[PDB]
Amino acid sequence: KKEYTGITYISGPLLFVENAKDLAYGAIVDIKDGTGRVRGGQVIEVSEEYAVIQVFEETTGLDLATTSVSLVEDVARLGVSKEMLGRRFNGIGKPIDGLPPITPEKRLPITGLPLNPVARRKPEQFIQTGISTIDVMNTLVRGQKLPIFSGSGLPANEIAAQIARQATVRPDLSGEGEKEEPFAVVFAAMGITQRELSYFIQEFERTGALSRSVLFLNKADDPTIERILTPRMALTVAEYLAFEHDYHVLVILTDMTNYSEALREIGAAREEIPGRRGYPGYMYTDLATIYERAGVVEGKKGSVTQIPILSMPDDDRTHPIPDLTGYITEGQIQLSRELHRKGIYPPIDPLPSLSRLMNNGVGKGKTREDHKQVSDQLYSAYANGVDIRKLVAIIGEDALTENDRRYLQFADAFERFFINQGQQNRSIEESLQIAWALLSMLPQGELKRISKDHIGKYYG
Amino acid sequence: MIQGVIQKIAGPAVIAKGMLGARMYDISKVGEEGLVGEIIRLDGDTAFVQVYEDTSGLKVGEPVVSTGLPLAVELGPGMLNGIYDGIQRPLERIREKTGIYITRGVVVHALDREKKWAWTPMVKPGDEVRGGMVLGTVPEFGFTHKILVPPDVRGRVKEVKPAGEYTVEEPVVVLEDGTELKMYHTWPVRRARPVQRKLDPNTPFLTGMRILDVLFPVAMGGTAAIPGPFGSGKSVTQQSLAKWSNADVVVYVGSGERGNEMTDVLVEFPELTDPKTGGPLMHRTVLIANTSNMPVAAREASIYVGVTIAEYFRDQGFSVALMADSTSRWAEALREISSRLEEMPAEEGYPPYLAARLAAFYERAGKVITLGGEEGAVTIVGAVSPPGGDMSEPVTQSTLRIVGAFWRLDASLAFRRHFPAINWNGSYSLFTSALDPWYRENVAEDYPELRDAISELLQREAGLQEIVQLVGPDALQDAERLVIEVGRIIREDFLQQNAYHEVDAYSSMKKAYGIMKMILAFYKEAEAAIKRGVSIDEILQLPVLERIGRARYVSEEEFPAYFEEAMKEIQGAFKALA
């Protein structure tokens, strides 16, 4: 196969090869130096004069006299099959579990394709996360993208790890046959430290969560382009298991801030003039091409569900990273520093949280039929309980009536009991049972978002 | 048609050489796959082509060929009940041809070439034809689709196809010129389709919903924004106008949407009912639909393709309702292109064409006498959609610097269960002044005053819950407990419109006049009652509050008698309270 030796220029991550009209734009290439060491790159531009290759690793060692480029493949593709479960790969999807390299039933363009809008399907079934604040209030529904908004310091890894261990499909609540219903987790970690990798592995093994997962682990010290590829690898394997194998897949992407931080970098190093608050102008589109690879489709039993996870730079929900993710994804879960001191975990406060696809995933045949209303009440009664806290806050305590005293103690214990569950795996029923014993603190006529009868069932 | 090759490829940008005599903005076909693109630059013997789709895999040296024409839309029978992407490709046919995912370089046709249409000719040989005139007719669902002479074309008719069943490809009419006219013509989307004459906002756009009809109304062909924030019922309110508006056709362009937001439209719409016919509303709607990850260029054409399509249906002499949602997302798309065209970012994260263009689009709205002589309109209802909840968006400014009304939705009102969740203090109408003649003429000599009296009680209700807010309701003079309690009555019995209700789902100006007049009648009989030593609480016990209450639920036909009797009952029930 051809070697291209006409290298005219190397600077930063770029190398230029003359007489390479036969390299396709976007082609993955191999690059060998005098020492014999081999290195990846990608054709990012091509003309009659030369091709610009963007090198994957450092550029140290390359020269213009003993360096040759060659085609590895015209489009970045991925060796994929359904035997990737229990496995554990890296950025580029080569094995890291000390197990054997695997045999693929197809090689897929890791860039994927947009789903045809007309071929989609309103997401309808719920996914039990085991966290009450998620499950009852902000339900993750199959086909959704619902990210966790966290903070440097805050324990997203733990939540990530937890939903990964706990999550499950509830066929017995939908009558559904369990056969066309295998449930898998595609974990994609971007720019993690060895300390956190150690953790996620430990966590996936500890209770065998590993056997039904495919890990795409990427470290902080890896060549940055591997970070850009990780979410693509993951979603490739996920679209595959989902839309050809009827898997319900849950994709967790931590940490998107590291992703976006890598996206720009690959642009500070490709010349590009930065957009708002200094990330790439097309960051909205790029993220779109990631998050949008989720959903459910007519004529298919399977699904792809995303939980991206992102530490906001200074708890600034208006930062490009969370702001853009916000315009693309379907709500979010937010990690309150406020709940972190009071010793609460998982620090998820329901009022800034929202799951926009929820109302179509709960209810008769999907969960329990009080669900929707109970969730709204639970909201209502916390919003109503929080706004009293503000009324009797900084200046003088005890400026309160009888009733509003009782919407008050419904906020204290809604934290201690509902929000603060530690590492309990709570089924939707147990979540609705606690919800109901939290509600019944209020008198009957105050549960206004609930049909009169439901009350009498679960209230007494 | 010019025949060059690829000299360079860098992302979606391609340089073709040897394309001699290629022209600015002509559509190109790029690479062996024939990917569609636009010439954005001519430099010597090269043309910079902006490729609408992913170029990855193309090699220097492949063919590049000019289509010789700028971006255009196909205007003919075949669009209604259709679902196109932002550059007029039928997504249904694509699915069928390629499956669940969208494959690049797929070549389908806006208008089905196989389907047979029932031509009824309306011109004979020797007839003179000018652009815009009706050649003949073809049924499309309920509508009598008119076959139009392209604007720009004219001459004498030589031959005509006899009534029969033809496809859109067939020369139904042929001129002495030799010019063949078909059931469709193409037309460039960035160029306003011509009209004979652009008309004044002296007519109502009848939406069906009282608060916008009575309070913040739009003229026929006017424009209007809505801020569709979550929590408020954007869909529902939007869907209702499509169902109940004095519009013959509804074009809904929406692109740059969340896949499931958008999908919520291709699944919901096919289930709405046309109140005029009893069958689907889809049969008189074109939807252009587009998503986050579908190509930049389509997300930006979207509202233009949609406005041209809208203009075409205008041109046949119908009222056309176009709602684009989301308009901020469109703007996002215009930002990306600007950046891709490597343009230096302007102040406040948008290119400085943003307004201009929001206007090259928005100003194509208008009610007109068409080239065919008929009258028609395009009334636009854009949505401004920033989850940031920031009216500061240069997008919202420019829009609002331009539309003739704003219908401010509010998730706050929704939470209270007030529907449709539009805010009377935030919203407004610019058309109001010049619709009063029509009003006095078509509703009642004393329309404006009555609606003025209502918005007047509203302000006052609004500025009383404010001095109840800081001094308690005890400090309220008698006339206050009343003002608040009718402000109440108007909220619950006049601003609230049940959208899923078989009657209240719609209300016309006449019924809206009645429900108004009753409130103010009741009001001024209470006004003279408290002044006379009658208990406001006894006033508030009167069983004719319920004749008011349950009025919006009464058949439109049964209302005139309901009004006449209830108006008579306000007298007797108040005269009884000596």
Do A345 and A155 touch, CB atoms closer than 8 A? Answer: yes
Torsion region of B33: left, alpha or beta (phi above 0 gives left; psi -120 to 50 gives alpha): alpha
User: For residues A119 and B448, what is the distance between their CA atoms, to the nearest angstrom?
Assistant: 49
State both tokens at B291.
Answer: 């998503």
Residue in chain A nearest B339 by alpha carbon: A281
Nearest-Cα distance to chain A for B329, in Å, is 9
- Nearest CA-CA distance, residue A357 and chain B, Å: 9
A70 CB-contact burial (10 Å; exposed 0-12 / middle 13-18 / buried 19+):
middle
Last residue of a domain, one of B181, B201, B219: B181
What is the spatial distance between Cα B8 and Cα B49, in angstroms, rounded to a whole number? 10
B263, B341, B390, best to mutate vs chain A, most A CBs in 10 Å: B263
Provide the CB-side half-sphere exposure for B530 (13 A, CA).
16
* DSSP letter (8 states) at residue A3: -
Beta strand ranges found along B328-485 (DSSP E): 366-369, 375-383, 405-406, 428-429
B293 → closest Cβ in A26, A47, A292: A292
The CATH number assigned to the domain holding B13 equals 2.40.30.20
Chain B residues with CB under 8 Å of A300 CB are 100
**Nearest-angstrom CA–CA distance, B554 and B565:** 13
Tell me the CB-side half-sphere exposure of residue A57, using CA atoms within 13 A: 13
Residues forming a β-bridge with B378 = B320, B366
Judged by CB atoms closer than 8 Å, whether chains meet at B101 and A114 is answered as yes
The domain boundary, picked from B411, B429, B447, lies at B429
Strand B285-291 and strand B249-257: the pairing is parallel
Q: Is B340 on the interface with A (CB under 8 A)?
A: yes
Interface residue B296 vs chain A (CB under 8 A): yes
Both B240 and B91 in one domain: the answer is yes
d(CA B566, CA B548): 8
Beta strand B134-140 with B117-121 is: antiparallel
The token duo for B208 is 């069906």
B166 contacts: CB under 8 Å, gap ≥ 6: B116, B117, B119, B172, B183
For residues B361 and B395, membership in a common domain is answered with yes
User: Residue B94 and residue A116: Cβ atoms within 8 Å?
Assistant: yes
Using alpha carbons, select from B568, B560, B492 the residue that is nearest to residue B211.
B492
Buried b (16+ CB within 10 A) or exposed e, B356-395: ebbeebbebbbbbebbbebbbbbbbbbbbbbeeeeeebbb
Residues B435, B221: Cα–Cα separation, whole Å? 13
Question: Chain A closest CA to B442's CA: distance in Å?
Answer: 43
CB burial class (10 A; 0-12, 13-18, 19+) of residue A257?
Answer: buried
Sign of the dihedral through C-alpha B395, B396, B402, B408: positive
SS3 B33: coil
- For residues A357 and B506, what is the distance between their CA atoms, to the nearest angstrom? 29
> A76 and A110 in contact (C-beta within 8 Å)?
yes
Interface test with B, best of A29, A43, A115 (most B CBs within 10 A): A115
Q: Contact A320/A275 with Cβ under 8 angstroms?
A: yes
- Specify the DSSP element, H or E, that contains A324: helix A320-328
Angle at B254 between CA B249 and CA B257, to 5 degrees: 155
Place of tokens 């389908």: B108
Is residue B258 located within the same domain as residue B397?
yes
Whether residues B272 and B345 share a domain: the answer is: yes
* Same domain as B264, residue B127: no
- Residues of chain A with C-beta less than 8 angstroms from the C-beta of B296: 285
What φ, ψ does residue A227 adopt, rounded to 5°? -75, -40
Distance CA A266, CA A272 (A): 9
Peptide bond into B326 cis (omega under 30): yes
Comparing CA positions, the residue from A289, A312, A375, A372 lying closest to residue A114 is A289
Cβ within 8 Å of residue A430, ≥6 positions away: none
CA distance A198 to A196: 5
Name the strand (E) or helix (H) holding A47.
Answer: strand A38-47
Interchain pair B292, A291: CB under 8 A: yes
Q: Is A431 exposed, middle or buried (0-12, 13-18, 19+ CB in 10 A)?
A: buried
How many residues in total does chain A contain? 460
| Residue B292 phi, psi (nearest 5) | -25, -60
DSSP three-state, residue B166: strand
Is residue A146 a contact partner of residue A251, using CB atoms and an 8 Å limit?
no
B4 and B128 part of one domain: no
User: Residue B183 in contact with residue B160, Cβ under 8 Å?
Assistant: no
Could you give the CA distance from residue B215 to residue B452 in angstroms, rounded to a whole number?
9
Q: Which residue has the tokens 């806006």?
A: B110
Minimum distance, in Å, between the CA of residue B553 and any CA atom of chain A:
23
How far CA B16 is from CA of A107, A446, B106, B490, in Å, comes to 32, 71, 21, 66
Closest-CA distance, A115 to chain B, in angstroms, reads 4
Could A119 and B99 be called an inter-chain contact, meaning their C-beta atoms sit closer than 8 Å?
yes
CA distance A93 to A84: 10
| End-to-end CA, chain B | 90
Q: Which amino acid is at B411?
A: A
The domain total for chain B is 4
* Identity at A459, one-letter amino acid code: Y
**8 A C-beta contact, residue B259 and residue A292:** yes
Q: Cis peptide leading into A255, omega within 30 of 0?
A: yes
Residues A167 and A161 sit within 8 Å (Cβ to Cβ): no
Rounded to 5°, the CA angle A305-A378-A254 comes to 30
CATH of residue B252's domain is: 3.40.50.300
Task: Tell me how close the Cα of B576 comes to any Cα of chain A, in angstroms.
Answer: 37
Integer-rounded Cα Rg, in Å, for chain B is: 28
Interior/surface letters A158-185, b for 16+ CB within 10 angstroms, e for the rest:
ebbbbbbbbbebbeebeeeeeeebbbbb
Residue type, B200: D
**Domain that residue B346 falls in:** 72-114+182-429
Phi, psi of A314 (to 5 degrees): -135, 50
**Whether the Cβ atoms of residue A45 and residue A52 lie closer than 8 Å to each other:** yes
Burial class (CB in 10 A: 0-12, 13-18, 19+), A293: buried
E strand residue ranges, A193-261: 213-219, 248-254
Cβ-nearest to B101 among A48, A113, A328 = A113
What CATH number is given to the structural domain containing A315? 3.40.50.12240
Show the CA angle centred on residue B79, arms to residues B298 and B322, nearest 5°: 65
Tell me the C-alpha distance between B517 and B490, whole Å: 11
First to last CA, chain A: 78
Q: Residue A40's beta-bridge partner residues?
A: A30
Domain end residue (candidates: B162, B181, B200): B181
Residue type, B528: A
What DSSP string runs through B220-251? Answer: TT-EEEE---TTS-HHHHHHHHHHHSS-SEEE
C-alpha B167/C-alpha B188 separation (Å) is: 22
CB A242 within 8 A of CB B101: no
Q: What is the dihedral of CA A317, A318, A319, A324, to 10 degrees?
A: 90
- Chain B residues with CB inside 8 Å of A354's CB? 230
Distance CA B322, CA B324 (A): 6
Same domain as B107, residue B64:
no
Among A75, A117, A356, whose Cβ lies nearest the Cβ of B57? Answer: A75
Q: Which among A16, A21, A25, A110 is the top mutation candidate for probing chain B, defined by the most B β-carbons within 10 Å of its own β-carbon?
A: A25
Which among B292, B329, B336 has CB closest to A281? B336
Among B304, B350, B326, B354, smallest CA distance to B257 is for B326
Which tokens belong to B139?
């049924």
Tell which residue, A385, A380, A378, A419, has the closest CA to residue A400: A385
Given an 8 Å threshold on Cβ–Cβ distance, is B8 in contact with A275? no
CB count within 10 Å of CB B573 equals 16
Question: What size, in residues, is chain B?
Answer: 578
Residue B34 falls in which region: left (phi positive, over 0), alpha (psi -120 to 50) or beta: left
Among all chains, which residue has been given the structure tokens 């214990």?
A413
Six token digits for residue B151: 């604007």
B489-492 long-range contacts, CB within 8 A, separation 24+: B489/B519, B489/B522, B489/B545, B489/B548, B490/B454, B490/B457, B490/B458, B490/B461, B490/B519, B491/B418, B492/B549
A191: containing domain: 1-460
Spatial separation of the C-alpha atoms in residues A264 and A280, rounded to whole Å? 5
Q: Residue A248 is encoded by which pair of tokens? A: 């319900």
With contact defined as beta carbons under 8 Å apart, do A61 and A55 qualify? no
Compute the half-sphere exposure of residue A410: CA atoms within 13 Å on the CB side of its CA.
Answer: 28
Task: Please name which of B198, B216, B211, B208 lies closest in space to residue B247, comparing C-alpha atoms.
Answer: B208
Check CB contact under 8 Å for B10 and A119: no
Both B538 and B507 in one domain: the answer is: yes
How many domains are contained in chain A? 1
Say if residue A101 is preceded by a cis peptide, omega within 30 of 0: no
CB contact under 8 A, A118 and B55: no
DSSP A446: G
Contact predicate B73/B309, CB 8 Å: yes
Residue A195, H or E segment: helix A194-206
Neighbours of B83 (CB within 10 A): 25
B5 and chain A in contact, CB less than 8 A: no
Residue with tokens 């008719």: B157
Helices (H) and strands (E) in chain B, counts: 16, 28
